[PDB]
């Protein structure tokens, strides 16, 4: 079975970088399809962040293109999310998801990570 396990610090200080990781099991990241990152704002609204194809190509939402950097590690079969210079605007629950692709039906995010609530705060937390 396919599983997406998310991890990473769910609390970042403004101007810093948000680093999230998605560990995939039961399916190789290089085999095919697209590996995405999406966010759910407090007002309960979703926004597609971007992805990294099975070949290693990127596709970022122009609304964040200049800030994000979605990379991957073939050996560990996991992809990452990096959002530079965060603001309280970036506060949301981030999710990683696999997007299938068929020539007739198009794209569809079938497998979703459990989600990670990230809070852009000045508060201190024991690392």
């Amino acid at each position: 079975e396919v599983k997406l396990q998310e991890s990473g610090a769910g609390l970042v200080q403004p101007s810093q970088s948000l680093s999230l990781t998605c560990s995939v099991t039961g399916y190789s990241i290089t085999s095919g399809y697209y590996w995405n990152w999406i966010r759910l704002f407090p007002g309960n609204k979703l926004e597609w962040v971007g992805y990294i194809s099975n070949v290693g190509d990127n596709n970022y939402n122009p609304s964040l293109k200049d800030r994000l950097s979605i990379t991957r590690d073939t050996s560990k079969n996991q992809f990452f999310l990096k959002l530079n210079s965060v603001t309280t605007e970036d506060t949301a629950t981030y999710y990683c998801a696999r997007s299938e692709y068929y020539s007739v039906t198009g794209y569809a995010m079938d497998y979703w990570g459990q989600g990670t609530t990230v809070t852009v705060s000045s508060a201190w937390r024991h690392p």
Partner: protein, 107 residues
């Protein structure tokens, strides 16, 4: 960027009946529209894809249909419990965009 408008914007309904949500894109998306279900606990599952295709595990009571710019997500009944927020997204062109959402509650 294409923008979808869901309606009714989060409206409650009774368990002993059906409900029909809808999405309207600012452009022609050509049936490339999917529906998602975000449960209260936070878990989000895929419900419908390509306007009417049902995903694995979703009950046959979930319909979903449309074309051009107007689409819908018809349910047969809320029993036992389908209380959660439903989001729609197009994938005709990048970047992909989601709808406002429609939180379904009980009367």
């Amino acid at each position: 960027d294409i923008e979808l408008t869901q309606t009714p914007v989060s409206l409650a309904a009774s368990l002993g009946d059906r409900v029909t949500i809808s999405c309207r894109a600012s452009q022609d998306i050509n049936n490339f529209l999917n529906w998602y279900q975000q449960k209260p606990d936070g878990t989000i599952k895929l419900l419908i894809y390509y306007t009417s295709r049902l995903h694995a595990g979703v009950p046959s009571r979930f319909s979903g249909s449309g074309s051009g710019t107007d689409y819908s997500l018809t349910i047969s009944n809320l029993e036992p419990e389908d209380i959660a927020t439903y989001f729609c997204q197009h994938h005709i062109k990048f970047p992909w965009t989601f709808g406002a959402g429609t939180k379904l509650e009980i009367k």
